[PDB]
Amino acid sequence: MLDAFSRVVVNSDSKAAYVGGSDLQSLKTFISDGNKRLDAVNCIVSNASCIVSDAISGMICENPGLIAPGGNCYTNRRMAACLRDGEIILRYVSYALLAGDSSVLDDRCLNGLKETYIALGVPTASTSRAVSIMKAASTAFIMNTASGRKIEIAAGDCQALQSEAAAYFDKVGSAVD
Amino acid sequence: RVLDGLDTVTQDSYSFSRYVLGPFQPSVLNANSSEYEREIAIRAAYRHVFGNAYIMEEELAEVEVTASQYKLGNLTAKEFIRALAKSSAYKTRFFEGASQYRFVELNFMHLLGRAPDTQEEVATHMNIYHAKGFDAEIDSYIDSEEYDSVFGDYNVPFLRFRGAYTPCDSFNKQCALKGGWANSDKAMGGAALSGYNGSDGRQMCDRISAYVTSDTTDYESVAGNSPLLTTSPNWLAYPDPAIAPTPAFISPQEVREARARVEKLREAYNEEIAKTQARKNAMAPFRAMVEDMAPMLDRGVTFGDPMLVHPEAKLPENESALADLGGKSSDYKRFWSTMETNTVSRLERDLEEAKAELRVLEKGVDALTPMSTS
Amino acid sequence: MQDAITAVINTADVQGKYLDDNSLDKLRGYFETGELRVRAAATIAANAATIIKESVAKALLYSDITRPGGNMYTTRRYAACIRDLDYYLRYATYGMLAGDPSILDERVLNGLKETYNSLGVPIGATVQAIQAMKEVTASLVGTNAGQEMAVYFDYICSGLS
Amino acid sequence: NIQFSGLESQVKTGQLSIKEFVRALGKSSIYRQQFHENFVDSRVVELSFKHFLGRGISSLEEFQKYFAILSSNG
Amino acid sequence: SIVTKSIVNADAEARYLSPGELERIKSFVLSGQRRLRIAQTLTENREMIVKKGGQQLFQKRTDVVSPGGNAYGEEMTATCLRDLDYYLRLVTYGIVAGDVTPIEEIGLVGVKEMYNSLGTPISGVSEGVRCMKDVACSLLSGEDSAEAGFYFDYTLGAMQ
Amino acid sequence: SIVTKSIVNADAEARYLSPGELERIKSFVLSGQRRLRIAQTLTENREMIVKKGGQQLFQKRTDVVSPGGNAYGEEMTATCLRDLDYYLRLVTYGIVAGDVTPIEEIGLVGVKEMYNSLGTPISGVSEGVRCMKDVACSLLSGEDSAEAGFYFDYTLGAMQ
Amino acid sequence: AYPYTGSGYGG
Amino acid sequence: MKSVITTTISAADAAGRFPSSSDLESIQGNIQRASARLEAAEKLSGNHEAVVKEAGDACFAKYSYLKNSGEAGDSQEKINKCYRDVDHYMRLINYSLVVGGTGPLDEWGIAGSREVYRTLNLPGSAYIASFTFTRDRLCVPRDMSSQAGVEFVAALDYVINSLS
Amino acid sequence: MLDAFAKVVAQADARGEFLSNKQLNSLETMIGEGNKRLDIVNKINSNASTIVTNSARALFAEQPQLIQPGGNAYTSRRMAACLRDMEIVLRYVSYAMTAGDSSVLDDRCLNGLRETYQALGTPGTSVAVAIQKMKEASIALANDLNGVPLGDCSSLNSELAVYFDRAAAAVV
Amino acid sequence: QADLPPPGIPS
Numbered sequence A: 001m002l003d004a005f006s007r008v009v010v011n012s013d014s015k016a017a018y019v020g021g022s023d024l025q026s027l028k029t030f031i032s033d034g035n036k037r038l039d040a041v042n043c044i045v046s047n048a049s050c051i052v053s054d055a056i057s058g059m060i061c062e063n064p065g066l067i068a069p070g071g072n073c074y075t076n077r078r079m080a081a082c083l084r085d086g087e088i089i090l091r092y093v094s095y096a097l098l099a100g101d102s103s104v105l106d107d108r109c110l111n112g113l114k115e116t117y118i119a120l121g122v123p124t125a126s127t128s129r130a131v132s133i134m135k136a137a138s139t140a141f142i143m144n145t146a147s148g149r150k151i152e153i154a155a156g157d158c159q160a161l162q163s164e165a166a167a168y169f170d171k172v173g174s175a176v177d
Numbered sequence B: 001r002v003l004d005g006l007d008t009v010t011q012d013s014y015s016f017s018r019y020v021l022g023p024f025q026p027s028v029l030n031a032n033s034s035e036y037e038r039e040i041a042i043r044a045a046y047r048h049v050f051g052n053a054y055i056m057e058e059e060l061a062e063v064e065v066t067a068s069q070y071k072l073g074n075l076t077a078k079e080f081i082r083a084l085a086k087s088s089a090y091k092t093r094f095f096e097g098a099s100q101y102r103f104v105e106l107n108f109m110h111l112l113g114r115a116p117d118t119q120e121e122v123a124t125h126m127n128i129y130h131a132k133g134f135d136a137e138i139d140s141y142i143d144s145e146e147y148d149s150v151f152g153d154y155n156v157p158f159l160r161f162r163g164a165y166t167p168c169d170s171f172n173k174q175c176a177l178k179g180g181w182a183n184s185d186k187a188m189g190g191a192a193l194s195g196y197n198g199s200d201g202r203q204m205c206d207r208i209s210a211y212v213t214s215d216t217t218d219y220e221s222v223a224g225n226s227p228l229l230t231t232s233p234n235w236l237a238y239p240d241p242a243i244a245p246t247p248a249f250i251s252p253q254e255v256r257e258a259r260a261r262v263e264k265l266r267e268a269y270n271e272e273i274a275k276t277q278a279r280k281n282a283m284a285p286f287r288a289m290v291e292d293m294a295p296m297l298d299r300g301v302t303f304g305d306p307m308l309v310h311p312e313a314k315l316p317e318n319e320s321a322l323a324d325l326g327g328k329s330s331d332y333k334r335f336w337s338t339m340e341t342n343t344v345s346r347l348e349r350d351l352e353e354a355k356a357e358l359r360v361l362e363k364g365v366d367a368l369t370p371m372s373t374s
Numbered sequence C: 001m002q003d004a005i006t007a008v009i010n011t012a013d014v015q016g017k018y019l020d021d022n023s024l025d026k027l028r029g030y031f032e033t034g035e036l037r038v039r040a041a042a043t044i045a046a047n048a049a050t051i052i053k054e055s056v057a058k059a060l061l062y063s064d065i066t067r068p069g070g071n072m073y074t075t076r077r078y079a080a081c082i083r084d085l086d087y088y089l090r091y092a093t094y095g096m097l098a099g100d101p102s103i104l105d106e107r108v109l110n111g112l113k114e115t116y117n118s119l120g121v122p123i124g125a126t127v128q129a130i131q132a133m134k135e136v137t138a139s140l141v142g143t144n145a146g147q148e149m150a151v152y153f154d155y156i157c158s159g160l161s
Numbered sequence D: 001n002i003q004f005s006g007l008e009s010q011v012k013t014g015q016l017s018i019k020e021f022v023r024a025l026g027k028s029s030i031y032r033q034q035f036h037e038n039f040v041d042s043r044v045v046e047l048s049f050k051h052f053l054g055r056g057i058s059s060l061e062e063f064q065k066y067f068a069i070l071s072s073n074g
Numbered sequence E, F: 001s002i003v004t005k006s007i008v009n010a011d012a013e014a015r016y017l018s019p020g021e022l023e024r025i026k027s028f029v030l031s032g033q034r035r036l037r038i039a040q041t042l043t044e045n046r047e048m049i050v051k052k053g054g055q056q057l058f059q060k061r062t063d064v065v066s067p068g069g070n071a072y073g074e075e076m077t078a079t080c081l082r083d084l085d086y087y088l089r090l091v092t093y094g095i096v097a098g099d100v101t102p103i104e105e106i107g108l109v110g111v112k113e114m115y116n117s118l119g120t121p122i123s124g125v126s127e128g129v130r131c132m133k134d135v136a137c138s139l140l141s142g143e144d145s146a147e148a149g150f151y152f153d154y155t156l157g158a159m160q
Numbered sequence G: 001a002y003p004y005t006g007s008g009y010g011g
Numbered sequence H: 001m002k003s004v005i006t007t008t009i010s011a012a013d014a015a016g017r018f019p020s021s022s023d024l025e026s027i028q029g030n031i032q033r034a035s036a037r038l039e040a041a042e043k044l045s046g047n048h049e050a051v052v053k054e055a056g057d058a059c060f061a062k063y064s065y066l067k068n069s070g071e072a073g074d075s076q077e078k079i080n081k082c083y084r085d086v087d088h089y090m091r092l093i094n095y096s097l098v099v100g101g102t103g104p105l106d107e108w109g110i111a112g113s114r115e116v117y118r119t120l121n122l123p124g125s126a127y128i129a130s131f132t133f134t135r136d137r138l139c140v141p142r143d144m145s146s147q148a149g150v151e152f153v154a155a156l157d158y159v160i161n162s163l164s
Numbered sequence I: 001m002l003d004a005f006a007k008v009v010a011q012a013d014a015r016g017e018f019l020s021n022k023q024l025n026s027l028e029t030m031i032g033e034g035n036k037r038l039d040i041v042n043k044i045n046s047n048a049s050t051i052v053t054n055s056a057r058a059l060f061a062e063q064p065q066l067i068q069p070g071g072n073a074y075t076s077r078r079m080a081a082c083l084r085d086m087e088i089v090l091r092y093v094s095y096a097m098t099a100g101d102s103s104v105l106d107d108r109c110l111n112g113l114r115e116t117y118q119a120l121g122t123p124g125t126s127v128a129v130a131i132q133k134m135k136e137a138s139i140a141l142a143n144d145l146n147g148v149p150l151g152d153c154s155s156l157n158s159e160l161a162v163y164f165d166r167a168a169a170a171v172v
Numbered sequence J: 001q002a003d004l005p006p007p008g009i010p011s
């Protein structure tokens, strides 16, 4: 687990020298963009149960073989687990939004996922579809462009941050596949 | 059914018990972690496995090989605990100087996280001792299916606040066997005091009588030094769960007064309950009268604005589902002020305060001969 | 009794000194809060009736107390009850506007605990009625003056308990 | 509609004796507004005997006694 | 009671009871069973008095049961008729007591301060008790409802 | 008045006026012109306050102008608005006096005995004075209607 | 259970 | 209760160290964000009673069947319990809003709510109807300040996502 | 003319030192106050005509001297000059409310004004009563909770009151 | 600098 700060520090220790101007300049930009980051993660830790519900429901409706017998969303138990796993994926993505570096997501969650879903028999393409639905829903929440929710916020461009969040979801969806 | 099963079968039990409040939760070395995370999880392990016992840096070298192997991630955490319990450290704290009841009881605490249920179980694990030594005891505790199911390979053992509890007395045990956050195992057992120079001290056991025969540990031992108390959730129970400290200068007159008070309060209590059944709906005959004359009193809405409606005519907006009876802010706010207002409720709290005081006396009256009477 | 000013003249007088800078800082504190105390007392004077009505409605009515055998049963007792809530509100305003709770020591809390324990007035219901007046009164006068009235209502509740 | 409710209640408790109730009634502003404001200090003296003792002035030296108390000290 | 009032009376006069007052106690203790008949009838006919008196009250006075009045809703109307039941109970106490002392000290001393603290119009309370007086006079004899009706008249005079 | 109250106070203490009370008289006599402005404005706006306050009274409280109320009829309504005119006049007297002694001795001492002898609900009178307080606070400034409005508040505290 | 002291008619 | 102070103290306790400058910066942030949230709590304790009225009246405005049969709203008394539980939740929003973490709202309201609401036939959809009504009746400009409003939205969000 | 800072810079050059970090912290604090400042000046600039008009109504009502023949505000010329002078003083108190310094209001309006209103025979204390009325209306207007986020603004109302008290102090 | 400055002499 490393933030943006520890990323600067680690890079400068690989270089084995002082911190200096330019790295600190980029980190100053991190601090001044801090409140937008705050409000974005707040937007994703807001309606998130709503996100996981809609995304897994969308994943079953797009691909009806999940709910079919002998699918991995068939039994009620298995449905509980899939929802829990959707929740967890969105959770670690939210951590990666706060940290600003994907060290936490790579070390805590991403490392054992491909082998694990293979060892359980979980269909991976379906999971990556659910990660994609969480991606699009999360970018729509993070841009204030959800239909059912439009909350007023001090205005500004936030494209950087949207592309950041989409980078983490693409890291997960590319990781399960 | 509110709940599915025991600690092992489902974890609904953990969710609405004291478990959530406590720092008695599992700890994991997550992937590649820095010294801050390694050192955290390794100390939380040392606190649980030695029961807050005190490991000098010399005694850490004993455990060091195994510590390094866990810092890898080569060893699972259960194999780490296995290597901790097989260490000569852990033998010296516990196996070397203990009676067998005490000792077996300990490896339930450190290994399983629970107090032993029955005498038969305790005897089973002792028979495993005389079969194949200290080593196969430790192996038997770690390789148990209940252990694996509850903790898994990862999680360091903790005190399980599973609301199931097979025997209540085993709960009272489990709070008694771990004496709160300040205490440790050398304090609970006089290993240090008995031993010369803080060492070679035989471990004392209590509650043997409660394993053997059907007994109960004291409210004191569970109330003074407990995970119940350290994980205190700041409760406004008029019941105090904390024991009142023993007052000095107790006289027998003070105690006959309190006993007599408790008995008077019990009598008044039973009378008031028996009436309480009698209350029914005293208000109900008048309620039925108003239900009868409903066609006169009940009135339909006029659809309009604040302007242009005859006065005292209800608008469909002011069909509040609490204005329809005529209740108020008070009426929803009433049951929160009920402790003082209610007679029965008032009596119950008095009873309990009186009982707590009575026990605190029963301690203090015990002292005889040399008491400065006051 | 004594206000904050009289208390300053008591300490400075009982030392024999004159007024030093500390005592003048205390007088400046009181003279800063002066106007706020005045308008708070004005508002409470305006809405005493509604404070007592709302607080009795929240705290005491439709319970065992106004049901028969409770202390509030009969008209004479009800009127004595709401009369006592009027005294707590009025003397709490005096204590606020003086800035010193010595009036509550002199003319209210003297012998009151012996009175209520003599009669059989429930202490806890009285305290909850006073706290109901504290919430309603703080809602009328606002934040700062609600803090000031809060320390004097809490002073009476500490007096009875 | 004049009601003195705490003098009344401190008498109903025996906290004020009935002498002190007559005292606190006699020192209230309704007593002075009723009997002191419209009358001369000599007449205030006389009416204070009617109300507080239930008799007239016995004699001249007693009037010269109490008139000094009223007249010098309110 | 009459006994209480006589004893208190010659007690404050610090004398024995007069022959006059003892004749008053004799006339009282001989008038007993007639009084117990009256309060027996008003006891066993209380539901007609409370119901019918409440109907004549709400029909004469549509203020308080209108939306925005004090007695609007089912719970509030039930409490209104509950209070009329109280004043009927106290009138029966005053009949067997042979004096209004029970009625005055249980019900009337400080009633205006109570209902002004509740927001209740006390003139509507007096109209309610007058309605129960008319029903209770419909349930009794001539001289009988004169007596009982006059105890109701005392309560009306205390409310107004 | 404040002067009357101070003179009566040290008169019953049989002394001259203290320094404190003389400072109070100074503050009063220097606050005069402001008071006279307020009572000037409430004087010359009386018909708006009585009419508009009567409208808000009867619209909030349709009891007394209903058939069966006290103020039912043209003559009775006129008398009702006549009394609101009285209390408006007395509030202006209390403003120029700097004390509620005019208000109290002309209007408040024994008001409940009078309106109970007339059959009038006095809570309706207090609601009327509160309605005139709202109108008169709509006609003045901030601190100004704080002062005058608080004189109205004294009258409401005397009615309730 | 909690009687209110009354000399006459209080309770 | 999970707050800034309890998380950093508890985390430093688990660490086995003195509180270093990181925890000090955490409580520095608490005393930065404190004013905005406390404005929210003051205004909530201002008009909570009207929040009970509109909240519960919208809650039966959506679902009328609760007043229809014996199920959950048979009497006026159970409706008093309805508005009562709504005021418990608003009071916990006030509490967590003052503390600033979701601690008292979690350990007092959410913990073991599912056994109770499942047991006593209480639907969560009516609660969610109430709270979504309260978040639809929120204006950033008006009432509480925009920063205060944001914190109120966050707390009430956590309520719904706890229940749903 | 000097602004709120121009005073800090001007003193710092009159001694010829730099600005210390203390001074810069003070300036940054006043900037964070500056949104509230602009809000007050917007409220004053909006309702200004009602301030001047109502305050003049209360002036002539409370002092009926000046509307009468022989009084100083007796002619339509003289009355218009009266109202316009009140508009002048309210304009410059708006200016010094923006600047944060009382310099522009002294230099343009107050300094020298007394010599004129003595030289015309105008009673200064009536002008002072006028400015007190604009202070009352202006502060009671500035404490309006309409359209603005709620918040604590006692210091800026205190400062604005210092500007109007300086105006009434400079005519009297 | 509370009082008014001399003629000219902008404060």
Ligand SMILES: *[C@@H](C)[C@H]1/C(=C/C2=NC(=C\c3[nH]c(C[C@H]4NC(=O)C(C=C)=C4C)c(C)c3CCC(=O)O)/C(CCC(=O)O)=C2C)NC(=O)[C@@H]1C
Pocket: H043, H044, H046, H047, H048, H050, H051, H137, H138, H139, H140, H142, H143, H144
């Ligand atoms: C703004 C986006 C709206 C709207 C807002 C209005 N709200 C009105 C009244 C009102 N609003 C609330 C909610 C508010 N009060 C609180 O205490 C809290 C939180 C603690 C909140 C979020 C309440 C309770 C009330 C009733 C009490 C009151 O009047 O303040 C309102 C007045 C409505 C009216 O009287 O017609 C408005 C206009 N304005 C709009 O244009 C959009 C839809």
Ligand SMILES: C=CC1=C(C)[C@@H](Cc2[nH]c(/C=C3N=C(/C=C4\NC(=O)[C@H](C)[C@H]4CC)C(C)=C\3CCC(=O)O)c(CCC(=O)O)c2C)NC1=O
Pocket: A032, A033, A034, A035, A036, A037, A038, A039, A040, A041, A042, A142, A143, A144, A153, A154, A155, A156, A157, A158, A161, H033, H147
């Ligand atoms: C403790 C919790 C906490 C938060 C939740 C944030 C909330 C927050 N956001 C901003 C401020 C802001 N927040 C956003 C955010 C965005 N605007 C958009 O139009 C996008 C929808 C969205 C993308 C994330 C923007 C653009 C600003 C203003 C620009 C900026 O301040 O950088 C501010 C500045 C002060 C103010 O505006 O009043 C604050 C405090 N900060 C905190 O301390």
Ligand SMILES: C=CC1=C(C)[C@@H](Cc2[nH]c(/C=C3N=C(/C=C4\NC(=O)[C@H](C)[C@H]4CC)C(C)=C\3CCC(=O)O)c(CCC(=O)O)c2C)NC1=O
Pocket: A066, A071, A072, A073, A074, A078, A079, A081, A082, A083, A085, A086, A088, A089, A108, A109, A113, A116, A120, A122, A123, A124, A126, A127, A130
């Ligand atoms: C920290 C991160 C973290 C994760 C990401 C998850 C990943 C994960 N999922 C499962 C387990 C599971 N995960 C799913 C989920 C699925 N159901 C389907 O229909 C889809 C293919 C898919 C959702 C998109 C299911 C159904 C199980 C249970 C599988 C089974 O028992 O058959 C397990 C085994 C343990 C268990 O049963 O819960 C693990 C480790 N767990 C973690 O700790």
Ligand SMILES: C=CC1=C(C)[C@@H](Cc2[nH]c(/C=C3N=C(/C=C4\NC(=O)[C@H](C)[C@H]4CC)C(C)=C\3CCC(=O)O)c(CCC(=O)O)c2C)NC1=O
Pocket: B017, B018, B162, B163, B164, B165, B166, B167, B168, B171, B235
């Ligand atoms: C195997 C048998 C078995 C039992 C019989 C229970 C008995 C039991 N109850 C509690 C614990 C509890 N039990 C209750 C129950 C009560 N609430 C009240 O209002 C009533 C007085 C009473 C129900 C009639 C409560 C409220 C707690 C939690 C107490 C607290 O934390 O304050 C605990 C402590 C652990 C926990 O918090 O769950 C135990 C051992 N547990 C077991 O394992």
Ligand SMILES: C=CC1=C(C)[C@@H](Cc2[nH]c(/C=C3N=C(/C=C4\NC(=O)[C@H](C)[C@H]4CC)C(C)=C\3CCC(=O)O)c(CCC(=O)O)c2C)NC1=O
Pocket: H059, H066, H071, H072, H073, H074, H078, H079, H081, H082, H083, H085, H086, H088, H089, H108, H109, H116, H120, H122, H123, H126, H127
């Ligand atoms: C600290 C937080 C806290 C809460 C949030 C409540 C939640 C809660 N509500 C009830 C209990 C109840 N809650 C309701 C409420 C309802 N009536 C309906 O028509 C609606 C569906 C709903 C209101 C929207 C009812 C009717 C009961 C009683 C249920 C019954 O006895 O049948 C109970 C069981 C104990 C009791 O009977 O009071 C609890 C714990 N209590 C708490 O301590």
Ligand SMILES: C=CC1=C(C)[C@@H](Cc2[nH]c(/C=C3N=C(/C=C4\NC(=O)[C@H](C)[C@H]4CC)C(C)=C\3CCC(=O)O)c(CCC(=O)O)c2C)NC1=O
Pocket: H145, H146, H147, I035, I036, I037, I038, I039, I040, I042, I142, I143, I144, I145, I148, I149, I150, I151, I152, I153
């Ligand atoms: C160009 C002109 C111009 C203005 C006139 C202001 C107007 C203005 N004020 C505020 C914002 C504000 N304005 C005030 C002011 C007030 N405090 C109170 O006690 C009083 C009611 C009031 C002063 C009289 C406050 C307190 C805020 C912050 C509100 C909040 O965050 O809660 C904001 C939102 C941005 C911010 O937070 O600064 C704006 C646009 N801004 C401008 O750009």
Ligand SMILES: C=CC1=C(C)[C@@H](Cc2[nH]c(/C=C3N=C(/C=C4\NC(=O)[C@H](C)[C@H]4CC)C(C)=C\3CCC(=O)O)c(CCC(=O)O)c2C)NC1=O
Pocket: I066, I072, I073, I077, I078, I079, I081, I082, I083, I085, I086, I088, I108, I109, I113, I116, I120, I122, I123, I126, I127, I130
């Ligand atoms: C730059 C700043 C600046 C000012 C502050 C004014 C000051 C000022 N006022 C007047 C002139 C005047 N000012 C007033 C004002 C008054 N009417 C009264 O009843 C009150 C006493 C008083 C308002 C409070 C009147 C009435 C005149 C005209 C006097 C006359 O002609 O008799 C004149 C002479 C020129 C003229 O007639 O306009 C000047 C210089 N002019 C300026 O250029």
Ligand SMILES: CCC1=C(C)/C(=C/C2=NC(=C\c3[nH]c(/C=C4\NC(=O)[C@H](C)[C@H]4CC)c(C)c3CCC(=O)O)/C(CCC(=O)O)=C2C)NC1=O
Pocket: C060, C065, C071, C072, C077, C078, C080, C081, C082, C084, C085, C087, C088, C091, C107, C108, C115, C119, C121, C122, C125, C126, C127, C129, D006, D009, D010, D012, D013, G004, G005, G010
């Ligand atoms: C300001 C100075 C002052 C105070 C405060 C005061 C209190 C006071 N309260 C009294 C009685 C009482 N006080 C109460 C009060 C209550 N009952 C309830 O249930 C409520 C919970 C509670 C009020 C909140 C009741 C019922 C009585 C009457 C007891 C009786 O005589 O029957 C009495 C006895 C006199 C009487 O009222 O008959 C005094 C003297 N007296 C004073 O001089």
Ligand SMILES: CCC1=C(C)/C(=C/C2=NC(=C\c3[nH]c(/C=C4\NC(=O)[C@H](C)[C@H]4CC)c(C)c3CCC(=O)O)/C(CCC(=O)O)=C2C)NC1=O
Pocket: D040, D041, D042, D043, D063, D064, D067, D068, D071
């Ligand atoms: C508040 C209105 C008021 C007044 C004025 C008043 C006067 C008053 N003057 C008295 C006596 C007296 N007053 C005087 C006065 C005077 N002797 C002279 O030669 C002078 C002309 C004059 C003094 C200027 C004398 C000598 C006596 C006593 C005479 C005696 O006792 O023999 C007495 C007799 C008893 C007593 O004083 O206590 C009264 C009551 N009482 C009142 O209530």
Ligand SMILES: CCC1=C(C)/C(=C/C2=NC(=C\c3[nH]c(/C=C4\NC(=O)[C@H](C)[C@H]4CC)c(C)c3CCC(=O)O)/C(CCC(=O)O)=C2C)NC1=O
Pocket: C061, C062, C066, C072, C073, C074, C075, C078, E064, E065, E069, E070, E071, E072, E076, E077, E079, E080, E081, E083, E084, E086, E087, E106, E107, E118, E120, E121, E124, E125, E128
């Ligand atoms: C005998 C001794 C005695 C009496 C008389 C008495 C009266 C009394 N009336 C009460 C309320 C009430 N009283 C009424 C009465 C009326 N509403 C109307 O519109 C009618 C005009 C009027 C009756 C004629 C109503 C509606 C309430 C309920 C107010 C509320 O709590 O919601 C209450 C508050 C407790 C409750 O009922 O919930 C008391 C204590 N209490 C006593 O201990």
Ligand SMILES: CCC1=C(C)/C(=C/C2=NC(=C\c3[nH]c(/C=C4\NC(=O)[C@H](C)[C@H]4CC)c(C)c3CCC(=O)O)/C(CCC(=O)O)=C2C)NC1=O
Pocket: F057, F064, F065, F070, F071, F076, F079, F080, F081, F083, F084, F086, F087, F090, F106, F107, F118, F120, F121, F122, F123, F124, F125, F126, F128
């Ligand atoms: C200066 C102090 C003062 C006051 C206040 C005063 C009032 C007063 N009010 C009266 C009548 C009245 N006053 C009212 C008032 C009202 N009716 C309602 O329902 C409302 C609550 C309220 C109006 C707000 C009514 C209806 C009457 C006549 C009732 C009747 O004659 O039947 C009368 C009867 C004869 C007459 O007016 O000439 C007096 C003397 N007298 C005084 O000297």
Ligand SMILES: CCC1=C(C)[C@@H](CC2=N/C(=C\c3[nH]c(C[C@@H]4NC(=O)C(C)=C4CC)c(C)c3CCC(=O)O)C(CCC(=O)O)=C2C)NC1=O
Pocket: A047, A050, A051, A053, A054, A055, A057, A058, A059, A061, A062, A133, A136, A137, A140, A141, A145, A146, A147, A148, A149
């Ligand atoms: C019939 C089977 C079925 C579903 C289930 C949905 C699932 C679904 N949600 C989407 C996408 C989606 N979903 C949500 C979340 C969702 N919307 C909200 O406003 C709130 C409050 C939500 C949770 C309750 C959002 C915010 C989006 C982005 C689109 C939008 O702006 O609404 C998308 C678009 C994916 C993409 O862009 O590639 C799909 C397919 N679609 C289906 O065909």
